[PDB]
Structure 1
């Protein structure tokens, strides 16, 4: 009944979000909500380099226009985060690319 552009949101850990034996590790969450079509491609970029390992994407589930939600988790290292590395979530939607840039800089 309708087509809406996907929304890109990136979640990052806080300053006290790292735990475990050294080196500490955390996770990054990229979620798209109220997007159509249901299929979606999620890719992670680190300083222009594609990430091909250490990531797990949950299956798309249903949250009147039909809505869907997708959750993706990427494992990151504390050392890389401290080096002001920029993480970008790549979303593909009918040939359109949406990018969101996040960083620890204030």
Structure 2
């Protein structure tokens, strides 16, 4: 039982809509739930979860559809990972801001 690593990717500073990828790696067991947040509000649509693949370790990725205007307006996006009763939250923002 190892805590999953949470990493959130951001679009390039010099331009690219785009997608947000949250990756959980080196986690056990295989079942895991990944969700997305927008400014502390639950997201009901616009996100998909790819099937878990084998890298024993497993890898799971998620895709969230975002717009260029909303992302660059300093909106807060958080990837929520639930594993073995533990919740992990990662916050990202614009680097050039």
Report how far residue 105 of structure 1 moved.
Answer: 4.0
| Counterpart Cα distance in 2 of 1:92 and 1:10 | 15
- Give CA-to-partner distance per residue, 1:16-51, whole Å, 9 cap, x none: 343xxxxxx110000011011111111100101111
CA contact (8 A) 1:84 1:105 kept: no
CA contact (8 A) 1:28 1:73 kept: yes
Gaps of 5+ in 1: 19-24
Report how far residue 15 of structure 1 moved.
Answer: 2.6
| Counterpart Cα distance in 1 of 2:20 and 2:68 | 12
Report how far residue 10 of structure 1 moved.
Answer: 0.5
| Counterpart Cα distance in 1 of 2:45 and 2:53 | 23
| Counterpart Cα distance in 2 of 1:97 and 1:51 | 17
CA RMSD of aligned residues (A): 1.1
CA contact (8 A) 1:90 1:98 kept: yes
Deviating beyond 3 angstroms after TM superposition, the runs of 4 or more aligned structure 1 residues are none
For 1:23-38, list aligned pairs within 5 A.
25-38=17-30
Distance of aligned partners of 1:5 and 1:72 in 2 relative to their CA distance in 1, 3 Å threshold: same
Give 3-state SS (helix, strand or coil) of 1:39's partner.
coil
CA contact (8 A) 1:60 1:69 kept: yes
TM-score normalised per structure 1 = 0.85
